[PDB]
């Protein structure tokens, strides 16, 4: 278990719109919005900071 470095691979549940969206879809779409904000922050904010 003495790992020196790691590569992480993220596969979240993708953005959902059904005929009926419930608490499950709120949490999924919130996770997708957080990951998109990670993209926006990395690309546009941390870069210019």
């Amino acid at each position: 278990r003495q790992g020196a470095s790691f590569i992480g691979i993220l596969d979240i549940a993708g953005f959902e719109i059904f005929d009926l969206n419930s608490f499950e879809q709120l949490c999924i779409n919130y996770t997708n919005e957080k990951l998109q904000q990670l993209f926006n922050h990395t690309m546009f904010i941390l870069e210019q900071e």
Binding site: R1, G3, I7, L10, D11, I12, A13, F18, E24
Partner: protein, 147 residues
């Protein structure tokens, strides 16, 4: 770890089997994807100072456990329910008290197919994946008994 002692390594072979398993228990056919996953996962692969793989850790998120109970008009529950019901042999049907798809009311749509797949063959693929990962038959049967 490619080396003078050239091999088909154990961790490599097992790592590749983790996704078929979590997909069998985790994924389901929705109206948007026939292999809709219904959980998030983060796979962390650990490398030594030489850059060879020493371990992987899979973290999962937000499983939509409600899908076990009730589904919309063209969808399936998690694939394993269909793999077991179609792939079990008569001794396994007897031991697990399995019934026709129309007996279960948690399978809202009854038997529903995925184009280009057979649940009876995906069952054998899943059980081979579990064997390769080293889950013993008592634990595989525990899983199927809980399902």
């Amino acid at each position: 770890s490619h080396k003078s002692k050239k091999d088909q390594g154990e961790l490599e072979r097992q790592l590749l089997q983790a996704n078929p398993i979590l997909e069998a228990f985790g994924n389901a056919k929705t109206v948007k994807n026939d292999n809709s996953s219904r959980f998030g996962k983060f796979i962390r692969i650990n490398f030594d100072v030489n850059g060879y793989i020493v371990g992987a850790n899979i973290e999962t998120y937000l499983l939509e456990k409600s899908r076990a109970i009730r589904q919309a008009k063209e969808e399936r529950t998690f694939h394993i329910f269909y793999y077991l019901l179609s792939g079990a042999g008569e001794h396994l049907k007897t031991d697990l008290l399995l019934e026709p798809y129309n007996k279960y009311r948690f399978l809202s749509n009854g038997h529903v197919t995925i184009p280009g797949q057979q649940d009876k063959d995906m069952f054998q693929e899943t059980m081979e994946a579990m064997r390769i990962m080293g889950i013993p038959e008592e634990e595989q049967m525990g899983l199927l008994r809980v399902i």
